[PDB]
Design a protein around this nucleic acid. Structure first.
Lengths: 17, 56, 103, 117, 110, 142, 150
RNA sequence: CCCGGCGAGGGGAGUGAAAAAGAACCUGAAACCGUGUACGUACAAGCAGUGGGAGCACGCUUAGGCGUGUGACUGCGUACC
RNA sequence: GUAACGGGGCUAAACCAUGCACCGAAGCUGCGGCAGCGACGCUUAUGCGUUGUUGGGUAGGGGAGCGUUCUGUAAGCCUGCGAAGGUGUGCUGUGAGGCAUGCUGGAGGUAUCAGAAGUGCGAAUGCUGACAUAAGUAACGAUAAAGCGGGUGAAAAGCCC
């Protein structure tokens, strides 16, 4: 019952500038 | 591509209502052996239409 | 056989031999109550009030119960203002039995 | 002194659930959602304790208007005649009389007409 | 007469065995037996074994004459679930629930 | 004590006939709505259909004052790409004369299952002949 | 709390609430925002307050007649039976024996029994005085107590 | 002892105060999942509640409502921090 | 998508002057119930034969109270003809709550007044365990490919030849 140790880095956000 | 809110057990049951099966209700008794078998299928022992068909 | 009388600010339509739950009165539980303020006396022929409180009519009734009304909860809540208040109430009643109606 | 609050929490949750009993869906099963229902139910009850008086007044006025128009007079004229005749009867008893005994309402209407004219 | 019979810790899922149970719910013993025999489900044989156990119990531990017997109360219920970890993509880990169900068959003459 | 409330099972519904010839459309429709809702009865109940059955004849002869006969547009939408259609009073009378009366009475009536039930009693006939003589529908002078 | 100061997960990007250490009070197996410390609960009571309370409790006992003054109260032998008889004949069960001079015989007799206790005149406490329903006093003990109270 | 697959489990018998104390074993609630009962629901729109409210199913003294469940219809009513 | 009276619909059911009636709020009045504030006739640690008035409320300030662990009371009391917890019911108090009991349980609990809180959870993308949701859906993990016959076995396409 171990919590997920590794979580992938979030997908880069779409350019909103 | 994902649910905004959790559906309810009522909707779940309504959806599953159509998942129930239907009984064959077509048990046929052999003329000679008098055994129940699926219609247009050979009996377990190997008798179909009175005459034997499997010889085993 | 029915009559209309005002006892606690509200008119009650009562017939002979029936009990009516009305507003509490400072009266004993087994003492006949007289109500001379009657609005109409009804029979096969109808007599109406030309002036309030008829002329000589009166209602004779006997007190039966002196309990309280059913529980009612008063809940006051203000949305998004961090305010809620709770309160209960049980209005008092003095049930009486209408035994006699005069003319 | 460590104090365990499980019993008190369960008692309060059961109180809320029994207050909310009879609702549809999770409103009668989940305490977190049932709590909103009881507060909203109390607000509705508080509003209705006042709305009932005016709704019954509306119904009684409608019944009296129906009876008066059947007898051949308008509700406003009938009430004006009653006031001129100095009659303190209220809409509730008036509607009861109209519903049950027609002769009594006819007497009321004729006396009101006599007072008006 | 109760003559209960159950098979706890069954591998088949309750959601998938209730479908078979409904077919025989409230039918005669022989009709239920043949329906289960000729039903194309693993749950069919799984519940046919329980029905055979129940009818044998009625024969031996209770009154004879299985002819006038009906399956009055039958219901399928979930059982203890076993946790299994299945690797997924991107290193993500999900949990597989090996669901087990409890099936109970009650047969009575009346 | 408890106020009287009409029980639907013991409700007496009478049959009336109203002539639509030489009658104002709105003034007839409002009276029909009042009759359907039962506000003329001494036992009116808001939540019970205590009204009566009315048979309207000569619906095509209903009259509208002013230029409404030509400038009154009954719009409706079919719930489609552009399915908005407009029909004048003359066009509606030519196609079917009962629908104008039905729409007017439906608008007068309240909304909901109770309103639909009240509207269900109306039986509008274009001609002067009706097939409800078996119910003794005495004419109503209005 | 035994553990590590390492963050359970990186501060940003994770789909979980912000955390700084497993030792957080809102985490299982470790916490307590305000842990208790060994502290002295002793309360400062002035000698005047103590004397006033003692005099007041003695006056209340005298007014209620729960205080009894007797002559030399001693037990010949260190036997609890003798003390039990000497209390039962006088009809006293829950009583405090206060003696000017402590005697080993009486001390041993009353040590085992709980309904009867023995204390010196100097060694008296308002808690004990209020707890005990009855009090029996010797002349020397009364004189010493009065002299101490002044 | 029996069903079952020389299994698992269950049903009988016995031990045991208790076996819904059977080793997945003290007391054993909730979210969640079914069965049976009574009601409502397949022409009716929206914080799913409140006030009124006919009918139906259960027991009562009296023979009318009263205690509970359901509740068509109706006015109002756009969750919590 | 009619959409610039709310709609129906209205030639008065449109606008100006007047009048008489009615609907119209939690506003006022009538009754009952509760609490604070000042007075006088009296009770004098408190009732009032009373009187006038106040009682929407966030932040905030003041007062009065309900609930639980433990300690003294308490070697006293209930308790194996049934304690605690669990689960429904009827009363009761403006309230946090309190009382009794149908069934499970099985041996602990605790009256009144006081003393200290690790003393009350509905949220913090909170922590631990479990169960739903999607859902009996994707998928069952290189498109090199299985069939028949016999054998064991309760069951064979994947076990043996």
């Amino acid at each position: 019952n171990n919590r997920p140790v590794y979580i992938p880095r979030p997908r880069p956000p779409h350019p909103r500038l | 591509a994902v649910q905004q809110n959790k559906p309810t057990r009522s909707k779940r049951g309504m959806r599953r209502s159509h998942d129930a099966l239907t009984a064959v209700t077509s048990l046929s008794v052999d003329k000679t052996s008098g055994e129940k078998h699926l219609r247009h299928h050979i009996t377990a022992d190997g008798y179909y239409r009175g005459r034997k068909v499997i010889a085993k | 056989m029915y009559a209309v009388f005002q006892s606690g600010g509200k008119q009650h339509r009562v017939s002979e031999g029936q009990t009516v739950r009305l507003e509490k009165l400072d009266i004993a539980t087994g003492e006949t109550v007289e109500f001379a303020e009657v609005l109409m006396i009804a029979n096969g022929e109808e007599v109406k009030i030309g002036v309030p409180f008829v002329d000589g009519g009166v209602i004779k009734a006997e007190v039966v119960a002196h309990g309280r009304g059913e529980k009612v909860k008063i809940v006051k809540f203000r949305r998004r203002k961090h305010y809620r208040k709770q309160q209960g109430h049980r209005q008092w009643f003095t049930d009486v039995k209408i035994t006699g109606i005069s003319a | 002194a460590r104090v365990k609050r499980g019993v008190i929490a369960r008692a309060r949750h059961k109180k809320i659930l029994k207050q909310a009993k009879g609702y549809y869906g999770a409103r009668s099963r989940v305490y977190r959602v049932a709590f909103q229902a009881v507060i909203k139910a109390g607000q509705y009850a508080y509003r209705d304790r006042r709305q009932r008086k005016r709704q019954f007044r509306q119904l009684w006025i409608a019944r009296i208007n129906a009876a008066a128009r059947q007898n051949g007079i308008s509700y406003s004229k009938f009430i004006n005649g009653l006031k001129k005749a100095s009659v303190e009867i209220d809409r509730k008893i008036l509607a009861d009389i109209a519903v049950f005994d027609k002769v009594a309402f006819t007497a009321l209407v004729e006396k009101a007409k006599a007072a008006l004219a | 007469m109760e003559t209960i019979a159950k098979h706890r810790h069954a591998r088949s899922s309750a959601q998938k065995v209730r479908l078979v149970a409904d077919l025989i719910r409230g039918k005669k013993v022989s009709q239920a037996l043949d329906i289960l025999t000729y039903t194309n489900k693993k749950a069919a044989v799984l519940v046919k074994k329980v029905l055979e156990s129940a009818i044998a119990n009625a024969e031996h531990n209770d009154g004879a004459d299985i002819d006038d017997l009906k399956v009055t109360k039958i219901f399928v219920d979930e059982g203890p679930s076993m946790k299994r970890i299945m690797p997924r993509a991107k290193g993500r880990a999900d949990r597989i629930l090996k669901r087990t169900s409890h099936i109970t068959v009650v047969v009575s003459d009346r | 004590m408890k106020t009287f409330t009409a029980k639907p099972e013991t409700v007496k519904r009478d049959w009336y006939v109203v002539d639509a010839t030489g009658k104002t459309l709105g003034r007839l429709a409002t009276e029909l709505a009042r009759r359907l809702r039962g506000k003329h009865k001494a036992e009116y109940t808001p939540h019970v259909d205590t009204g009566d059955y009315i048979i309207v004849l000569n619906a095509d002869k209903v009259a509208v004052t002013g230029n409404k006969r030509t400038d009154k547009v009954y719009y409706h939408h079919t719930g489609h790409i552009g399915g908005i259609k407009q029909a004048t009073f003359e066009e509606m009378i030519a196609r079917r004369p009962e629908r104008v009366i039905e729409i007017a009475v439906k608008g007068m009536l309240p909304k909901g299952p109770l309103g639909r039930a009240m509207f269900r009693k109306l039986k509008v006939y274009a001609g002067n002949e009706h097939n409800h003589a078996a119910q003794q529908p005495q004419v109503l002078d209005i | 709390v035994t553990g590590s100061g390492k963050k359970p997960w990186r501060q940003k990007g994770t789909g979980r609430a912000r955390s700084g250490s497993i030792k957080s009070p809102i985490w299982r197996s470790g916490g307590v925002t305000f842990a208790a410390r060994p502290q002295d609960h002793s309360q400062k009571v002035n000698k005047k307050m103590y004397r006033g309370a003692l005099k007041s409790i003695l006056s209340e006992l005298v007014r209620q007649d729960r205080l009894i003054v007797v002559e030399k109260f001693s037990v010949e032998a260190p036997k609890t039976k003798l003390l039990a008889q000497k209390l039962k004949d006088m009809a006293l069960e829950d009583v405090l024996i206060i003696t000017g001079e402590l005697d080993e015989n009486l001390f041993l007799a009353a040590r085992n029994l709980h309904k009867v206790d023995v204390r010196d005149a100097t060694g008296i406490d308002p808690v004990s005085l209020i707890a005990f329903d009855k009090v029996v006093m010797t002349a020397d003990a009364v004189k010493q107590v009065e002299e101490m109270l002044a």
